[PDB]
């Protein structure tokens, strides 16, 4: 079990750790989060009490280093940093734990909600989508645009998701125009899976990372990416059977976790109705269709 200590909490802020959130008051004696499960990526995120604008946060994996949070009063935000002095870090954490100045990552011992949302998400791949190679953790916020959004403006601060565009020469083989537009299997299987992602695990990892960015920071571009990756599968007549079964599980847990009150804006009516009721895979997502119909029947 790993720990992310905080130097202090000088400004009132709502802090989230994965799917959990808690409030910290201005100058409250808060010194971080302990008992963080090893084996998963994690995200620690922030919304200031005085400017709910800009949710921001950091993706990290405690196996990759000792990380802490420190507020910067010049840049006005809580920053993640790496402590290279391992003995200094262990000493700091032990003192904060002895003084019980940390919230404990919940230890609910029955379901894998976070595992189920991050099954295919790897820190190495996050770091290729979010480029800042001198850090082992990755910063994301509400406003960051994607490389595709920038083609339609600061490249260093962009989300480099894989570009998916159904009306692109990459997606459409000369002479197979109708075939490739109406059945995207070529684009899914040859271009994207064999060619770019190499395997379905990496495809699902980016899909899951895009959803989490769309939900935790209200990142419009991440939302677009998540839906495009769903639609590319649902619009392919030929999809490996294990991929469909896994996609159904992935989406089920995503829909289950979504805040009920953010559904109106986080769920694209057109894509979901097409995917569940018109697409080649309309009958292949039983778990997802059942939770969607019972939880958001308005959208459909």
């Amino acid at each position: 079990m790993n720990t992310v200590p905080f130097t202090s909490a000088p400004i009132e802020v709502t802090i989230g750790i994965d799917q959990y959130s808690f409030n910290v008051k201005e100058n409250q004696p808060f010194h971080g989060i302990k008992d963080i499960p090893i084996g998963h990526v994690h995200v620690i995120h922030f919304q200031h009490a005085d400017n709910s604008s800009m949710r921001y946060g950091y993706w990290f994996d405690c196996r990759m280093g000792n990380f802490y949070i420190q507020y910067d009063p010049k840049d006005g935000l809580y920053k993640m940093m790496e402590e290279r002095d391992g003995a200094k870090f262990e000493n700091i954490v032990h003192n904060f734990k002895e003084r019980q100045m940390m919230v404990s990552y919940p230890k609910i011992d029955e379901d894998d909600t976070w595992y189920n949302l991050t099954e295919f998400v790897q820190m190495d791949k996050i770091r290729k989508i979010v480029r800042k190679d001198e850090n082992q953790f990755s910063y994301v916020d509400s406003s960051m645009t994607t490389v595709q959004e920038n083609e339609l403006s600061d490249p260093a601060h962009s989300l480099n998701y894989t570009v998916i565009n159904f009306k692109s020469r990459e997606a459409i083989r000369p002479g197979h125009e109708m075939e490739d537009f109406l059945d995207k299997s070529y684009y899914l299987n040859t271009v994207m899976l064999q060619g770019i992602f190499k395997n379905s695990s990496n495809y699902f990892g980016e899909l899951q990372f895009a959803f989490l960015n769309a939900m935790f920071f209200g990142n419009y571009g991440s939302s677009l990416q998540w839906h495009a990756m769903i639609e590319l599968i649902c619009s392919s007549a030929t999809v490996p059977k294990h991929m469909l079964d896994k996609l159904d599980e992935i989406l089920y847990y995503q829909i289950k976790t979504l805040p009920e009150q953010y559904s109106d804006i986080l769920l694209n009516e057109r894509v979901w109705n097409i995917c569940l009721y018109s697409s080649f895979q309309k009958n292949s997502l039983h778990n997802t269709e059942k939770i969607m119909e019972n939880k958001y029947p308005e959208l459909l």
Binding site: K167, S168, R169, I172, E177, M178, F181
Partner: protein, 237 residues
């Protein structure tokens, strides 16, 4: 974006553009089978591709053999249209290729966009105008070449005959759309108007009769009357 009444004179500027109408590509007769079920029999069709500034009509005849063994023909027809328009563009010298292609039906937008991905600078546009190009097969010489075709064939016409020697392309297009609107609303009446007088003939190399300027004014008035009529006969006004 979309073409409508406000941006109408754009049709007659000097940017090359083509209208594409797909309404006569896939044509059928519906009939009863011996068992009393219903079946269709395809007949030859055509793509109607028109330069509104010059009158140049690229009539691609769609022979019924292109449907043999194919499913979902109404969907296929839109993609075949887009394939043939793309092929026409590629066949033209660069300086004759259109800068815009305006489709008369919005269901042609995605098929044509996809077939024209190689031409990112050609704009594919819909229109809000209700244009009467479906009535092209009421022009006798066009219907004749379509029904006589035994294989795929492109035939070139000037749909304005020699009118541009005397009138502007705005006026010529307005005359064409009035004639076609009339033929679409009451083909028999419209054709009676156009041919009642046997001394006005259609030149061998023309589609419409050789009316004088004065006779066109009379003809044009008779077509307006017809359209207004039928609009009463229809709605009882």
């Amino acid at each position: 974006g979309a073409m409508n009444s406000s941006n109408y004179a754009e049709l007659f500027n000097n940017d090359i553009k083509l209208f594409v109408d797909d309404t006569n590509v896939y044509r059928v007769t519906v009939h009863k089978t011996f068992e009393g079920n219903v079946a269709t029999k395809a007949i030859n069709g055509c793509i109607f591709t028109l330069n509104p500034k010059t009158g140049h009509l690229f009539l691609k005849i769609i022979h019924t053999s292109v449907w043999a063994g194919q499913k979902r023909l109404s969907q296929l027809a839109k993609w075949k249209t887009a394939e043939e328009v793309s092929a026409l563009v590629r066949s033209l010298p660069k300086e004759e290729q259109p800068k815009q292609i305006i489709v008369t039906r919005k269901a042609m937008l995605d098929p044509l966009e996809v077939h024209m991905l190689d031409f990112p600078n050609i704009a594919i546009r819909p229109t809000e105008l209700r244009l009467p190009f479906s009535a092209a097969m009421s022009i006798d010489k066009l219907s004749d070449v379509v029904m006589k075709a035994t294989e795929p064939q492109m035939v070139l016409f000037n749909i304005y005959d020699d009118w541009l020697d005397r009138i502007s392309s705005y006026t010529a297009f307005s005359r064409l759309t009035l004639l076609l609107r009339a033929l679409k609303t009451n083909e028999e009446s419209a054709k009676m108007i156009l041919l009642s007088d046997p001394t006005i003939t259609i030149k061998s190399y023309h589609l419409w009769p050789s009316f004088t300027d004065e006779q066109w004014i009379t003809i044009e008035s008779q077509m307006r009357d017809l359209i207004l009529t039928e609009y009463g006969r229809k709605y009882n006004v």
